[PDB]
Amino acid sequence: MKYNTGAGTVPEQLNVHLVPHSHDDVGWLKTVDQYYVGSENYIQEACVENVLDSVVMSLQRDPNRKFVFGEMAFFHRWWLEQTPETKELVRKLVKAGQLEFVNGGWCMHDEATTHYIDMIDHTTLGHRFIQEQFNKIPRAGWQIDPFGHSAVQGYLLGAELGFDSVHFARIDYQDREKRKAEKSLEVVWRGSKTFGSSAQIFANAFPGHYGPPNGFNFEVRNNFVPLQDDPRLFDTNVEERVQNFIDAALTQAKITRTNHIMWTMGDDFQYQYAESWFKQMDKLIHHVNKDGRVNALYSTPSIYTEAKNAANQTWPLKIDDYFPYADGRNAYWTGFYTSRSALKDYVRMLSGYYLATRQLGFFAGKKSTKYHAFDLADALGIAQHHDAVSGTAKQHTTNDYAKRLAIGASKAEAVVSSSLACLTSKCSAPASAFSQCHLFNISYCPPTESSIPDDKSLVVVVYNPLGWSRNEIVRIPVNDANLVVKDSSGNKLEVQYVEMDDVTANLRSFYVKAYEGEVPKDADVYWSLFKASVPPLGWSTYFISEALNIGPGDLKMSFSGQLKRMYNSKTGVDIPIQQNYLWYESSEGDFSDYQASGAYIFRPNGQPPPHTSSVTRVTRGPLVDEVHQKFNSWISQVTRLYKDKDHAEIEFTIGPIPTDDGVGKEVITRMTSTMATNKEFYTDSNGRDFLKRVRDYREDWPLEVTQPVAGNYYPLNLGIYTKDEKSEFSVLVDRATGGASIKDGEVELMLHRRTIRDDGRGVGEPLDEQVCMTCEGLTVRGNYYLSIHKPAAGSRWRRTTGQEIYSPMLLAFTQENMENWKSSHSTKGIFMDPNYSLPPSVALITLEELDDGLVLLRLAHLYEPSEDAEYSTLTKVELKKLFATQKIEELREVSLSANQEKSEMKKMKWSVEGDDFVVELGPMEIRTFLLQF
Amino acid sequence: MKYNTGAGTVPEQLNVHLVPHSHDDVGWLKTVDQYYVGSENYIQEACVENVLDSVVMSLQRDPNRKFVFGEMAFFHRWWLEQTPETKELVRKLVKAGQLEFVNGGWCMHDEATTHYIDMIDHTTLGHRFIQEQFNKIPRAGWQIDPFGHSAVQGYLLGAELGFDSVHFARIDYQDREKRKAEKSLEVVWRGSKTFGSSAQIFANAFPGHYGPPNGFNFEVRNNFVPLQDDPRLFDTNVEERVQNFIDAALTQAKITRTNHIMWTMGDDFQYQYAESWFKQMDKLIHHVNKDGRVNALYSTPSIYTEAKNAANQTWPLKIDDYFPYADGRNAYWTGFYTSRSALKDYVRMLSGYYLATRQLGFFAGKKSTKYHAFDLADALGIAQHHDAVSGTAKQHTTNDYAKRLAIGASKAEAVVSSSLACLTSKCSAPASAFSQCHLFNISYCPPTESSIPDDKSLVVVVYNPLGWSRNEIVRIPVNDANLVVKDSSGNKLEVQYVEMDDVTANLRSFYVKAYEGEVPKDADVYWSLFKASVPPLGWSTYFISEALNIGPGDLKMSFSSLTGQLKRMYNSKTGVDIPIQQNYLWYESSEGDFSDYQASGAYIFRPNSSVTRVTRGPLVDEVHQKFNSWISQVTRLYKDKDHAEIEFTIGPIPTDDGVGKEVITRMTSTMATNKEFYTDSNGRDFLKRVRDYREDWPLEVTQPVAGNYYPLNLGIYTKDEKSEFSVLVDRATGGASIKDGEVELMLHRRTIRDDGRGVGEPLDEQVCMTCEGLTVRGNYYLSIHKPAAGSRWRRTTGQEIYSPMLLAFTQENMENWKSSHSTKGIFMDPNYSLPPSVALITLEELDDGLVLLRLAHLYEPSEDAEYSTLTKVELKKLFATQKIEELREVSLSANQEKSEMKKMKWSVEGDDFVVELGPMEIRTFLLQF
């Protein structure tokens, strides 16, 4: 029999857009490769190779069939295995529109715990591949699973990518009720207060889930009702199945605007045998359309959006974001804003490093390795997956993520070493030319710990990957107490010695062995500190050889023994402020609700958070004032006021979190003032826009308060701040972190979490992270940064220090005779014009060599219009001065993901309820260029 | 990457022939159509449409891949839904050898409870489709699942089909141990005593199961280890999987002759997503052969057989059969020999009716409808499946089988009625011309129960589908006591009235309602009996209108009187005389003990009186016997019958005491049978069985009852130096001789537990409206003869039991009838019979002008001095009203020129139009008129 599968939309009937898809997690209960090859099916039945294999076969069978695929991490692995014949069939299918890429990034990223730089990076990775192989530009965003949604997702990873639409299943459960009643599930979304309608997108919140209506899942071996239309066989059931379809369509139509609705015909890792689904959809399209009451068609999210746009309809407006997300009364998904802190820091650290790595490789002439096996691009793009950096994957999967990141970090570390060796001489240098250290956090750095032979000096090369000149404190572990630091010009520099502490030494012994496999030499005796000064996008070289109020600067802090006050003499801000460590007790269920706190969901006990305190050292010196604090045996902190820093730097060391008492614990630091913050506080969106949050309040619906704490937590990637008439109090993070203001004048950060129960959303594991050789709970160490400012003065600290945290100096070490080194190496350099700096409001967020001679460049304006009277303004960058030592032959502006010419981008129109080489940049703008040299 | 999937065999290595297959039950836990379309997956995950869809896609991707498929019941349902492009693609795959048909019948039939005529019929239905669509002749028999194997499967449904091999997984568990030790899993099997090596076949019994070695089932969503050979991905495992493969190959090689072994790469309803299997098999062939220690290839059972035949090797010999089957000490699969007796009788009755239907349609010029939806050919073909007539499907599946058979029977009924209307007239006649009755067993025949109008008669047309003239008793239910029966010439015939009985009357009210939905009219008051005389392949017409020792003939029986119940049988003309008792007993079903939990069930048999009337008359003497409230019997000696007909009525089997019961009739004599007894092979050859003994291995006796039951489709007999005692059945039935001079039949079974082989249902058959246990009624036939004179009774009466007269009824004034209708007729020559040794088992109109004809010699060489000899049939006299234009002798399934059939050679350890037939021969022909 021939089925009429080629139906399009029809004007005066309800149209049911059948969109076949397979939701393929880039790691979750299995690793990425396990999901691809289909191993470990006892954990979860899932094989993405079967999906792509069988979908291509089913699409070949009938030209009217369609399927949408998203995650290029899987597609690219599959593609490299396919024959030339298959690759050509795929080209035909993509060219015909039968297989359409939706989203098209390397993964479907989390939107809470991700940084916009990483979101752009992996999306570009996917889009370049799709553009190269198929000459296709994705037009529909696909965020069907991420646990809430960010403003930047809407305007920057949606509209600015060229997406007309973005589709997602998860919104807050109270909000969803209101949107159904108001038919506002689909909105025109303006995530940017700066760009408004110039960066808007059609946003489609599904009625419930991203699966088919009940009885319309057709996966092989499932117990569905096949449409039996053969009169030679018993029990035909055509009329019943057609009515099943209509009934489901009418229910959805009752909550949707226009005569067009969409069915997401798929689910988690479905389509292992695609024909099982397409057989049923073939028959349903055929028989439903013969019936004639409604109209069914094979479609895609972009065909659907096109029909939604051509309709005569005005649409409700959506501003800001969809955080936080709850799927039930006691189930706010705000715990994963913090879950797996160590993995979050690892991602953030490697992202900064990878940024610098691509800079140095470009100058030294290195060749792109983006699509090579186990490259850091693959590893960091996988890491953005919505179960990966978010913390919501199984532990073995999480270990596999970190294994892949470490492999890519090792490749990047060799690129940096070889590149700096070439660029500092007076490119083929060996990677052994310099040594580098990434375990300063636990004091392990063999290059600076080892002894210096006579007539030689420890050479320290300092590379600065910001487009600003920078002054910073180098702090290295040493075993000699009479070293001299000389700058490039022979002058001895002022130094300070800081004594090794017992917390750090105790971390060193355990974790060096865990990470590196062998037990290290004795704990270093001292830290050596000195202030380095480095040109923008350049290096300085130093030579090292043998011969209660604190605050070396304007910012002062007062302690008992605990913090009591912060003030700035020069600016005249002064608040009494206390900081303490506490923890919420993790709920394990109660009489009214079995929901437990777990890796996704933060549900505190409803008991007040238990209190922890004594000073163990107060240190004073020209470069740093320090207060070492121990709150208990597993919570210790160091507060540091460094020379020339407009902030304190608070180093936390948390763990092992004790659960032998059977009580899960979610550890916070809480900063309590008297500022009249009036329930307001500000948190960033993926590290960019600041969103005004209001305690216990929602703009889009009248919140029913059910979790007065968990319901006020928001995801941080840059930081959190508060203000009143007289002060502005700001906190910056070093990794994705959850933050809230639970009381006026009060800010808190959740820093580490260890539960005894799983939260029943499918991961099947309490968040119980341990380190072994003889195991104990994982300890995390990191920094948060705090400062005080007059109103309208804090934004420039937040932006400037945020970028500095993102992009620290890179240190490279070797031992050579100083004079011999100065004879064969330039001790100072800059790749920009010697007297050029990027404006203070701009960051060079992408600089990378692509295939052939093409260079990808991105410049970001860091400020929103109303933040800083001087810097929230129009500025310019002279690219001739940015590349002083090279001549631009070609310049070309492209879309954010570099898959379209900027000038060719077109926008849909919506009726919304309530309505030379010099590059200019307005507030919040990001401009992307392809260059040739 | 490209994989070297084109490997062939290599001489200096062990070769693993990978044979992809999907074992598709034609009904079992789900019905055949549910299995096809994949509905009711909560019962069992199984969809045959997916198998054929995805296998054809997978074969298309790589020309070196192969797959074997067997069950045309499924293939044909799928074929008619396919597009022209798919059909064209399938023809290319079949022509290239990528898709090979094995077996090729409509189903994979049981070999215990099936009759050879039904086996030939459904195999022909499948093979004719295969030949017409693809010009292919299957060469491998595929019997991987049936529970034991019959001698007729080997020589007749194997060798004579043109099969070089037959493959099966199930043999007795004790036999299997010996055959592993002696490397005699594979044999040259000679199932026929008569034909020996002229009808031999390579018989391959698998080491254990028909699935793959452990860890090589690759069905989508199963937890197997994929072969990961991409160095860009973590956890490559090529070495591990290659070694897994080798270890399994070497283990099998140690119990197999030659350097070729076969892996059956599949299982029940597998290959829903075929690419999941072929991907792994692609990579295993590639990397195993790169390694080079063993050799792997895509293969088929026929390619494997060729390799085994080409080896320089001598093979052990197998004779007789593989019954009974047991897979454990207390697990003899001999219960299903009797399970679902009523379904078995239903199949047997419809097979004979379908034989007559195709004769009558041919004579009347009816067009063939063999491949039409719900045709009786489909229903009867399906019913041969190894869970169907065997009785081992779920109850709802069994109901569906009976519904398809009833649909087919209703169509056959109209053909018979329309054909007889045309042929007796002086085809376009309507089905309403005659009525017919199939419920005589419960006394329900409205056409004869109904009053006759004055100046009209009940016209009775009697058709005889045997090639022998036949006299037999017509016995119809009537409501008037003074009816007169005249033959066609006007002669009044001797009649006998027999009173209705209470047992039948209560069956009638309950079962007529069950079968037809409404209670019947008043029970009929009498049976009218009379003797009809009918030409072979012809008819006689009769007109009915208003006007303790027994034995009306030579055979006599003596009953105690004090207790009822047989005591003695003797024939006064031949001098045979044996004391003999007949009793009803039951075994208690085991529900397992603490040492073995095995219970009795649908597959496995695991065991733990007054005369109410004596009737005498010129046409029948009978003794009604009531053994208890749910067991009654009537023993009948009919005029001119050389045997007693013993009608049992059993049920409802009481089950409330908590114990299951398996009911037998046991005939006990003093004959010196010396542990020997004789049972038939699919209604054909008799095999000598010996109590508690096995020819091929030293039996360890664990079930001295259950291990001595054998499947009967014709009957069972014993003998000593003075007598032969013979028992014929009317349906597939289990029988045994548990002591010397003693013979027993299992007639009905009801268990309270399942026997744990997958059907998940106690054998607990019930009739519901209120429910009660099912009641079965049927006949077995007893007789006594002098040695070497019993065989001719068994063969002749067996064919008469198989092919009874067909009665057609109407009411008309006699003279107006005789004026418009030929009262008497035959389609053969007016004075020609087939020889007494011959039966016309097939006569059928195919498409175009082709007619299919089969003649069978009923006798084995040693059986009857007169009839066990070469004979001949005159085809011009068989077809008297037509002229034979063309004759062509073909193979048994009619897919080959008989003259062009080729046989492999094996070295075996220990070594006009007149049709001639030697003993046990079946010759098949295509004729054109």
Ligand SMILES: *[C@@H]1O[C@H](CO)[C@@H](O[C@@H]2O[C@H](CO)[C@@H](O[C@@H]3O[C@H](CO[C@H]4O[C@H](CO[C@H]5O[C@H](CO)[C@@H](O)[C@H](O)[C@@H]5O[C@H]5O[C@H](CO)[C@@H](O)[C@H](O)[C@@H]5O)[C@@H](O)[C@H](O[C@H]5O[C@H](CO)[C@@H](O)[C@H](O)[C@@H]5O[C@H]5O[C@H](CO)[C@@H](O)[C@H](O)[C@@H]5O)[C@@H]4O)[C@@H](O)[C@H](O[C@H]4O[C@H](CO)[C@@H](O)[C@H](O)[C@@H]4O[C@H]4O[C@H](CO)[C@@H](O)[C@H](O)[C@@H]4O[C@H]4O[C@H](CO)[C@@H](O)[C@H](O[C@H]5O[C@H](CO)[C@@H](O)[C@H](O)[C@@H]5O)[C@@H]4O)[C@@H]3O)[C@H](O)[C@H]2NC(C)=O)[C@H](O)[C@H]1NC(C)=O
């Ligand atoms: C501070 O700061 C810092 C920063 O800096 C932070 O962070 C950190 O960091 C660090 C660095 O620094 C890091 O570390 C790193 O890490 C990574 C990861 O780790 C993880 O993972 C792993 C893995 O896992 C997996 O596996 C296992 C086994 O099986 C298991 O168990 C698990 O579960 C998983 O599993 C999964 O997956 C898989 C796949 O993958 C599958 O198969 C399965 O089935 C599943 O599914 C692990 O292992 C680990 O663990 C460890 O550790 C821990 C801790 O962490 C502990 O606790 C434990 O216990 C352990 O430990 C133990 O052990 C060890 C070993 O044995 C020893 O040693 C010790 O001692 C103890 O006892 C974890 O979990 C990793 O990966 C890395 O590693 C690496 O590296 C090192 C040096 O560096 C060494 O030592 C090692 O060995 C390694 O090495 C390697 O790699 C490299 C790169 O990466 C290279 O270069 C080299 O060469 C090597 O390699 C090569 O070779 C080899 C031989 O040996 C091989 O294997 C390879 O291969 C591969 O790949 C390829 C390509 O190429 C392919 O083909 C194949 O397939 C393979 O695979 C190559 O070839 C390190 O360690 C960490 O992680 C971090 N952390 C976090 C948390 O994240 C921190 O945090 C801070 N701190 C504070 C603040 O406090």
Ligand SMILES: COCc1cn(CCCCCCCCCN2C[C@H](O)[C@@H](O)[C@H](O)[C@H]2CO)nn1
């Ligand atoms: C509660 O205690 C434990 C327990 C378990 N079980 C049942 C185990 C059943 C195994 C079935 C395996 C698969 C094949 C079953 N075949 C499939 C063939 O295609 C079909 O034709 C055969 O009829 C049929 C039977 O052999 N019982 N009790």
Ligand SMILES: [Zn+2]
């Ligand atoms: Zn997901």
Ligand SMILES: [Zn+2]
């Ligand atoms: Zn079977």
